[PDB]
Every structure is written in structure tokens, then in C-alpha cells.
């Protein structure tokens, strides 16, 4: 409430000047340590480059590349041709709009009848105005969007009104990601360098960041070891690793390893609280509406209670069971007309992991009990199946299965890890899961 947006711009001024990850991280803690409460969530949301996490089903901002030129022309009282010609030379629009607030000003109508007043803007009203511009549906929207955006531009300072343009763009070429933010927050609020792993786990638990920050600043550094996945906010996936086919992976393992199929197409994540079907994508996005046909297949055939399961969605040949490229599946997930082309595009799902069913955590248990318990909850049919769990013994056996996998389509084959060390990590790459593919 009593804050201003000048501080964030000033602290971002000295960010494209250092090239050491051990230096900018130290400086990043100052703003968080000095900022006030009840707006800390907004401050955290600002840095990454989003107004809010993208699993709440909120619409995307509509301001684009060529509309900013018009907005700047309106704000700075310059002809469209002039600003267009100036921008055509220098690519960075921020520098294009940089000088235009020092060599020219505006008058308007407020003052001809008599009025002289100006106050520094606040972060709260900036966030509120951005949120209002976000929705702006109506019928005559464009004039209600550009003019609404131009207010802050006409109520800005020369240094401040350079990163706002990039904010509208959606990318910040400054040198700050998310892991660096976590590490800086751990040092600042926590006070101990070694106390960053608990924060990392807590972030791995919940896909959001503002809620984690607010519960960290409300209860304290503690109350993090006992957070469990509710049916809702998801958990970030893990990634694989690629290499050649030497006597390397087997020497890493030693014996037989769990071998699965490398399906092609969109992945998925399911959260069914016995009443509703929630489906997520390879990133955070509510694809439930775009995928309404299979909300019943994952409901009635999976007999049980609330769970969190992971699988993959791949298009099939309409005539009979036959894999198809993800490019073909891309055709249907765009149009509102559903029951005219949906019935011609089969959607078959597979299952490869389970996360949280019996009201207790399972992400630390070894990767055999989870598979054994998941093997129970399944109904044999032609729409829900399970992965091709097979075991080989040597390199002279992988090729026999690899050739069949190639003949059956898909990108190839994938290996896994068996034993106590095979735990389901969140994020990162690791070396537990390894993939091999062709060109």
C-alpha cells in the first residue's frame, strides 16, 4: 500500500551487469528482505513473468507485438510512422520507448480547466490494472485494452517505463529463473544455507509459488516436512537422459532392468476426487475442457477412490488399433465442434505410475510396491491398458525388443531403474531414467 514500483526497477537496473551466479544471488535477497508483507505473493509472481500460475484456467493477456507501438505512439504524442521507423532499426522495443520520455511530454485536457497534481504509482494498483486488462472481454475490446494500458505508460518515469514493456512481452532477459529464486529465499528468510533442501522439497510438493511463500512467511521456516498432495495443485514431473547404445547403461545397472515403451504424443496427469475429472499436460494447463470425451473412461473403469495417476494420450487409427503421430492428434484439439470429428479420432490412454491413493504419501517408497498396487486397479478393455513391462538380460536381448518397438511405431524404447535408489524425484534430470532414440 505504501510501496512504490521504483524500487523494483532500480534493483533490476543492476542486473544486466553481472555474469556470476554467485554474485547476483547475494543481491537478489535484499528486495525480499526489505519488501513489506501482504504483497509478497504479488512481488514473487512479478519476478518470474506471470500474473498467476497457469492451472487456474485464466485467460491469456491479449496485448501483442504491434499493439505496443500504437500504445507508445498514443502515450508519447508521436506519429505512428515515426515510432515505427525508429523501431525498425533497433530491435529492442525497450530502448525504442526509452528516450521518448525525456525529449517530449504531454498536456491533455486535465489542466485547461485548472488542475496540477501528480503522485508516484504503487505496485498494488499496477497489479490491479494488469488484472483488469487481462479480462476485458466485452465487444469493443481493442479500444478498451490499448487505452487502459496507456494509463500507466502516461503515469510512469523514464527508467521505470522500460521493463514494463518487457513485462508485457512476457520474457525478462535479466538473469533470474526459479531455482535461483528458491536458493535466494532460503538464504534470506531461512538464514541457513543448508536449509535450502527443505524449501526445494516444499516447492516440489506444490506447483504454485505464492502459496508456498505465504505459508513460509506465516507459520515460519518450519511446517514444511508434513505437506502432502491434495487433489488439486499438481507435482512437477521428472525428465530423462539420452545417450548412445554402448556397454554403459548395463554396466551402470549390472543385470536385468525394467523396460517400458516410449510412447509418442501428449502426456497426462490425472486428479480424480471421486466426483470430478482433472487432466493436465506436459506443463501446467487445464486441458479438461479440450478433452471431455475420456472423462468417463478414467472414471468408471478405474474403480476406487481419490487418486493421482500418470499416463500418456496418443491418437489411434479409427479403423483398428494402430499408432498415429502426435501431429495427427493436433488436428482435433482446437475446435469447439466436438461431436462431428471426435468420434473419428480414437484416444487410448496408458498408465505408467501412481502417486497418491491411500490417503498417505507414496513418492519415497521403492518402485515395485507402487507398480504392484497399481496393477490391481485396472479393468481390461480396449481403451485403458498398461505399459509393456518386460525384462531383458543383455544387449543381445534389447535389440530384439527394440526392433519390435520400431515395427510398432513410436519414438523407440526407454529404460528404468530398479532398487531402493529408484525414488520418484520431482524436477531435475537425474540418472535413474535413461532414454534412447533414433533420428
Amino acid at each position: 500500500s505504501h510501496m512504490e514500483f521504483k524500487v523494483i526497477a532500480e534493483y533490476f537496473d543492476k542486473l544486466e551487469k553481472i555474469s556470476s551466479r554467485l554474485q547476483l544471488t547475494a543481491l537478489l535477497a535484499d528486495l525480499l528482505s526489505k519488501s513489506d508483507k501482504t504483497i509478497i505473493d504479488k512481488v514473487v509472481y512479478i519476478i518470474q513473468g506471470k500474473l498467476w500460475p497457469d492451472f487456474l484456467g485464466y485467460p491469456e493477456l491479449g496485448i501483442g507485438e504491434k499493439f505496443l507501438i500504437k500504445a507508445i505512439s498514443i502515450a508519447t504524442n508521436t506519429d505512428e510512422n515515426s515510432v515505427e521507423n525508429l523501431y525498425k532499426t533497433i530491435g529492442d522495443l525497450g530502448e525504442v520507448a526509452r528516450r521518448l520520455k525525456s525529449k517530449q511530454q504531454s498536456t491533455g485536457i486535465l489542466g485547461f480547466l485548472g488542475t496540477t497534481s501528480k503522485e508516484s504509482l504503487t505496485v498494488d494498483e499496477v497489479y490491479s490494472t494488469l488484472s483488469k486488462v487481462a479480462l476485458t472481454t466485452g465487444e469493443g475490446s481493442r479500444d478498451l485494452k490499448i487505452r487502459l494500458l496507456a494509463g500507466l505508460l502516461k503515469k510512469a518515469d523514464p527508467l521505470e517505463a522500460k521493463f514494463l514493456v518487457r513485462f508485457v512481452e512476457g520474457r525478462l532477459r535479466v538473469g533470474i529463473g526459479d531455482a535461483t529464486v528458491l536458493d535466494a529465499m532460503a538464504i534470506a528468510f531461512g538464514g541457513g544455507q543448508s536449509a535450502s533442501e527443505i524449501i526445494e522439497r516444499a516447492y516440489n510438493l506444490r506447483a504454485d509459488l505464492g502459496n508456498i511463500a505465504k505459508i513460509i512467511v506465516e507459520k515460519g521456516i518450519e511446517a514444511l516436512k508434513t505437506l502432502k498432495p491434495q487433489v488439486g495443485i499438481p507435482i512437477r514431473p521428472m525428465l530423462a537422459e539420452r545417450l548412445s547404445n554402448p556397454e554403459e547403461i548395463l554396466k551402470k545397472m549390472g543385470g536385468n532392468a525394467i523396460v517400458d515403451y516410449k510412447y509418442d504424443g501428449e502426456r497426462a496427469q490425472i486428479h480424480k476426487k471421486e466426483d470430478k475429472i482433472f487432466i493436465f499436460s506436459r506443463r501446467l494447463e487445464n486441458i479438461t475442457s479440450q478433452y471431455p470425451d475420456v472423462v468417463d473412461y478414467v472414471s468408471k473403469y478405474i474403480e476406487g477412490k481419490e487418486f493421482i495417476i500418470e499416463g500418456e494420450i496418443v491418437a489411434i487409427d479409427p479403423e483398428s488399433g494402430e499408432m498415429r503421430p502426435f501431429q495427427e492428434l493436433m488436428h482435433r484439439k482446437r475446435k469447439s465442434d466436438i461431436y462431428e470429428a471426435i468420434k473419428e479420432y480414437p484416444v487410448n490412454v496408458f498408465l505408467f505410475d501412481l502417486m497418491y491413493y491411500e490417503d498417505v504419501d507414496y513418492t519415497t517408497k521403492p518402485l515395485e510396491a507402487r507398480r504392484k498396487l497399481l496393477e490391481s486397479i485396472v479393468k481390461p478393455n480396449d481403451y485403458v491398458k498398461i505399459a509393456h513391462h518386460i525384462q531383458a538380460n543383455n544387449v543381445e536381448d534389447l535389440k530384439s525388443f527394440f526392433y519390435r518397438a520400431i515395427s510398432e511405431g513410436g519414438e523407440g524404447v526407454m529404460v528404468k531403474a530398479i532398487g531402493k535408489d529408484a525414488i520418484y524425484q520431482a524436477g531435475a534430470r537425474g540418472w535413474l531414467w535413461i532414454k534412447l532414440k533414433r533420428d
Binding site: 504524442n77 508521436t78 486535465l110 485547461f112 480547466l113 488542475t115 487505452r147 496507456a150 502516461k154
Partner: protein, 245 residues
Amino acid sequence: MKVVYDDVRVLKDIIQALARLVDEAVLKFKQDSVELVALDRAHISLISVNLPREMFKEYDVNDEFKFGFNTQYLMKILKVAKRKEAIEIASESPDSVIINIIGSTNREFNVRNLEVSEQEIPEINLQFDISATISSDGFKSAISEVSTVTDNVVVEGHEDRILIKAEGESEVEVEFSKDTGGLQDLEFSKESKNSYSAEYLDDVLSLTKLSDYVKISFGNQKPLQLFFNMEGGGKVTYLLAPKVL
């Protein structure tokens, strides 16, 4: 808090001329009349509307009532009527508002009261150098003709004629000379030449069909003001800043 007005065709042009300039507005009911003042977001416009206590069918409000709304939603609830149907607005608690459409199969709507932030604005004392009182139907045609190709109009005057023309690739000209259907009043003062953006003039093209006489006034290094007059002494104003020059 009881207000009754007969026709809604009058309260459609005002609303569609207010939906194109702002996102929120406030209606102020007093012991004398109803006022409405609402700036624009970019501070390049001003539209004022006043309705007296003579068109209302013998109704009165005992105190103030700050009723807020959203332009799109209110304009969407004024498209129900087709013929000359009636309307009445009333409410008791300072939280909710009840709107009713009558005559045909009755309909009622419950509307929540939003909160709108507004700033202080002084009165209007803008004098100019011209008092043209040209017709109302010709202005719409002139604008829809000239402003279809250009992004800036030019308005120059003289002791005998009013010249409206665009420049650049095409030079079209329309005049309102004293010959047959032009001016009906003019002060000499001086000759002025100014410019205005072609987009801000389209937002007030549906406000025309309320009378048959406009009052175009402007001057050198001065804004643009136009005036309309209805029965009961209604007042509508529109102040527009000039171009960068």
C-alpha cells in the same frame, strides 16, 4: 429512491455513447435532477449528461444514491425492449438495485453495486472563435466520408464558409457555406486551422439522433467542443484535445 421514465430509446444512445469511452460510471440522483460526469482513461475526452425533473412521471428521491455499474452489462440489459415500453428503477438498502421492465410480459433484474474511483474535475469555461450551428444529419455524412481514409482531420474556417478537408494522398473537401444548408451563425474573430484524430470522433456518432441542431465551436490552439439540446433543457458536451501539432 423511485425513478420512472417512459421511453428507453432516449436511454440507448446515451449509453452506447458512454460504452465506447470508459469502463465505469456513476449516476448521481439529487433533489433537482440527475447528473453524470465521466472522464476517459487517456484524459482526452469528457462527456456530461443531465436530465431534469420534468420528464419523470411524478417521482422523487429523498436523498443521494451513488449507483455504480459496468457499461457492457448495463447496455446488455437495455436491449430487452423493442417497442415503446416503460422502465422504473428503485431500491431500498444501499447495497442492491432493482430494475424492472413492464408493459409486456414483466421482467425484473437484481444488480449488485460495484465501487468506482473518480477524481475531481472543474467546470467548463472554454471560449472559442466560431459558433457554427450547422445541421445534424450532414455532420454524420461528412465524417463518415472524410475519416474513412485518413488518421487526422483538418477543420479550417473563414468569414463566409466552414471548410472540412483531408490531406495527403487524397484531398476531399466538404463545405457548409451560407449558400443553401450551411451556417446559421458565425463570429468573425480570426481564422483557425487545427487537426483531430479520426477515431475519437466515431464514438459520438450515435448521439446525433436526439435533435436537429448542433453547435460546433473551436479556435486556434484551442480544443473542440460540440453541443446538443433536447426537450427539458438537457445538456450534452464533448471536449476533445487537439493533436500534437
